[PDB]
Amino acid sequence: SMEQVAMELRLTELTRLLRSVLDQLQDKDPARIFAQPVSLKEVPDYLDHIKHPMDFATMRKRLEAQGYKNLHEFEEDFDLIIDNCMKYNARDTVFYRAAVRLRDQGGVVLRQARREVDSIG
């Protein structure tokens, strides 16, 4: 149907905007701490602590399959990155501190993303 095509075009355009958001958030992680999944070879107990692991490569896979339907779903995954790290790692660690800085700097990007998503529809 034409309606299905129009819905698909909307999803494609959201995917474009989320890719730009993702790129901007990942720039706020210049140490690449959050770039890849925590390795279960190197941290073998991780899944005993963290039930829903997340990282930027994993988000990028979902994004490129058009697997985010709305900004809320995308933000859920970004918040998992931050929140998982702030539980597994202590306050005095470069990991925790990286997550705080990513959260604080990412807030700005996400605030305007929400306005754009709403504005453009």
Say how many residues make up the chain. 121
d(CA 105, CA 28): 7
Instruction: Report the CATH fold assignment for 1-121.
Output: Histone Acetyltransferase; Chain A (1.20.920)
Residue 20 CA, chain-centre distance (Å), reads 12
Which residue type is seen at 99?
A
- The domain segmentation of the chain, as residue ranges, is 1-121
d(CA 119, CA 10): 13
Query: Which one, of 25, 48, 5, 46, lies nearest residue 33 by Cα?
Result: 25
User: What one-character DSSP code corresponds to residue 89?
Assistant: S
Which residue type is seen at 71?
L
Long-range CB contact pairs, 3-8, < 8 A, 24+ = none
